[PDB]
Amino acid sequence: DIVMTQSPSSLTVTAGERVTMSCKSSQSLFNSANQENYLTWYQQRPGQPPKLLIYWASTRDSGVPDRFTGSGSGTDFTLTISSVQAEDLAVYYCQNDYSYPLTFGAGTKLELKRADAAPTVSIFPPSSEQLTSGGASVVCFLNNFYPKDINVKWKIEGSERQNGVLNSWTDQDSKDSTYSMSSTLTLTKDEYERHNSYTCEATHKTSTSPIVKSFNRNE
């Protein structure tokens, strides 16, 4: 097993700046006969297969921008992006293509840094179709904010509710570098109709005052 060590685990950079990530192999990938390094770089966007970036340690594949540059020899290799774009958000992998078994590094996650942005908050009552399910979901969308850290509090007639709440963050947006998160409060139909006022409060570092959206069953 040739172990491939990548550093760091994650990068954070503002659009337009230069990053360099490292890949180290436990044994040399350099073929002294033809003087080539059997090292390959990949870019993997969320939910997609890896995309070949550079092979032979430094040769770019067809259609890869020149801002991607691979360097190094032997056991030390680097991948440099001279001007990181918003679209460059991905996990970057190096791969031993020298000896069996072929092995990959653990990847380096490239995240982007941008100006703070307040979230847009929307609250949605349970649908009439779900009320026949015997369940009732109250959904709150917090769209396009930065940084990623954000807090959501649910209130039922002014009283805070803790569990039954499930949150999920999107991956960073690939063009504006913002984040979005959903918060779902799930109750039974009987407990939902036991109440009237439902409130979703978003507190982000962009303001000391929470953004509060409310829904009433008798609107």
């Binding site: 929307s122 609250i123 949605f124 009552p125 349970p126 649908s127 179709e129 779900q130 399910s133 979901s137 959904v139 829904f215 009433n216 609107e219």
Partner: peptide, 11 residues
Amino acid sequence: PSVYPLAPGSA
């Protein structure tokens, strides 16, 4: 899955 529409409150 059960797919439920998310429409804004009337108010």
